[PDB]
């Protein structure tokens, strides 16, 4: 699903995640994002099974390289 991710530096960006477990993740796995960024989710205890299985993660703008 859609989750707000803290981008290294300034401001906050929105990136798609796959660990969420929702339908959005299924399509996300095909990498259909114009930004093309790497999103990772830390295995931490959270009540995401209450309403809207969402998770907050960190993502860097574009791919890491040059």
Strands 57-59, 2-6: pairing is parallel
Experiment used for this model: NMR
Q: Are 29 and 19 contacting, i.e. CB atoms less than 8 angstroms apart?
A: no
Q: Which tokens hold the place of 41?
A: 């989710």
* Total number of domains in the chain: 1
* Closest CA relative to residue 58, chosen from 27, 14, 19, 2: 14
- How many whole angstroms separate alpha carbon 46 and alpha carbon 31? 26
| Domain hosting residue 41, numbered range | 1-66
Identify the CATH number of the domain in which residue 27 sits.
Answer: 4.10.410.50
Class of residue 28 by CB neighbours under 10 A (exposed 0-12, middle 13-18, buried 19+): buried
The CA distance from 31 to 66, in Å, is 20
List C-alpha distances in Å: 61 to 1, 4, 29, 34, 45.
19, 13, 18, 11, 27
């Amino acid at each position: 699903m859609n989750v707000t991710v803290e981008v290294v530096g300034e401001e906050t960006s929105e990136v798609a995640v796959d660990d969420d477990g929702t339908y959005a993740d299924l399509v996300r796995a095909v990498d259909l994002s114009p930004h093309e960024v790497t999103v990772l989710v830390d295995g931490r205890p959270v009540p995401e099974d209450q309403s809207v299985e969402v998770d907050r993660v960190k993502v860097l703008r574009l791919i890491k390289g040059g």
